[PDB]
Amino acid sequence: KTLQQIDKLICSWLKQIDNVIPQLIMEMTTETKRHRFDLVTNVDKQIQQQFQQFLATYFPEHQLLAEEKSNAMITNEINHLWIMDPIDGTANLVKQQEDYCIILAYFYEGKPMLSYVYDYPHKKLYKAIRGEGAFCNGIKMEEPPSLKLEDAIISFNAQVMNLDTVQDLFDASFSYRLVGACGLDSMRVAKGQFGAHINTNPKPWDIAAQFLFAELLNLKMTTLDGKAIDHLKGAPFIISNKACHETVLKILNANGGYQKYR
Template sequence: MEDLQTVHKKILDWLNEIVPTVKSDLSDDLTIETKLHRKDLVTNVDKKVQNFLVGKITEAYPTHLIVGEESQELTISDKREHVWVIDPIDGTTNFVKQKDHFCVLIAYYENDIGKLGYIFDVMNDDLYYAIENNGAFLNGEMIPAPEEISLQEGLISADVRHWYGKESFGRLAEESFDIRYFGCGGIDSIHVITGKFAAFATSQSGPWDLAAQLVFAKELGLEASRFDGGELHYLDHGDWVFANKGTYQDLLAILKDWNS
């Protein structure tokens, strides 16, 4: 296998090739389909980007496993020496309705260890990436570890659709400084990475929603776990929190009662 810097350069080339077409496709007629329900959308652009990335990965590394949100046939295996996790358009509803606040997510793992993570904020043309033992970067400039933020002073991003009416959501709104939510986990996570948000928490996710962020967490000293504080695996589904160290424990005290 090539060294990480060589793999990284290939990923940069792939993103620089496909991201401009995503922007241009916004002005074209989108083909929009639903998946599980009418608010669960997928477009021809999601599929186009995923097919492009799968093609590039397969061409360069034909033996590697790929886990992608928009391909049912790309399933998780017990053999995980080399695993890629991709979300071609994270925030598809935003892509369709706002033409903003969506991103491309890519992560690369070796033997279940996160090596590379990428979040491309398409409309701002900002590429965030993290490389194991080398730090995290924004457009090539190193990102400093965020200063610690307390829950009382921090903005918290929470998936309000699934929290509304819960006692724990009321506690979160009262005990944090305030609630924010972009509707795109990658964009919300960027705000945790840069210290603008104290935490991002969601009760529904898949591997493509969190695998890249786990690489950032390790490089920047951020916390990531299940709501109950349990260890988070990059191929997990369900609830998870991505948080500043100064917020994490107080936030978990609220999240443990999320189901009540």
């Protein structure tokens, strides 16, 4: 069926994008979408429009669900779907020129088959391939050791939570860190550097690649109620070492839950 051949083409596209991003940065251009903190650049747009055109030339029947376009349009009954976040970490890109990524994920009959989180700034490509595994620049990633929460660093956006449940999380974990790109905080979970990453209101594209990684590396990836996540619509989600999953959810839901209140 081979996914290995499709992988080869995706990786070849990613090498071509390597040479293209420098000139996009060279003529960078910033705009805001819904508020002053919601950024898009020509980089985002151009990376996306280019995969779209790659998809049309090499995979004309395949559909695309991507951040910087209408997804009117995508439905529950579609055989070949690619979910794309062309730059996950746009705020990092613009403000830092560091700690953003490209997220790509291919779904066959709803089932994740290929996934890509490309940390362009560090030249590290994490990929996952149903049947072969998950890799970082080609070296095989393995299931990470067990981490109990009290031993684990954790990552979440603390601005978007009430401070009571932020505190309970600080008190229950080893320490707290933030990269600020869902892709990259998730890959830190995947490598056992963090015990868990939480995003309370992610988009489909912000989490699309992670499903396959979570599956192949024996991580947990769920709603904040422990349920399967619909990959088409987002959901408040968590990616977690298996040893600290229930505990984080329990804390998040305790005492009336994690939502702001003021």
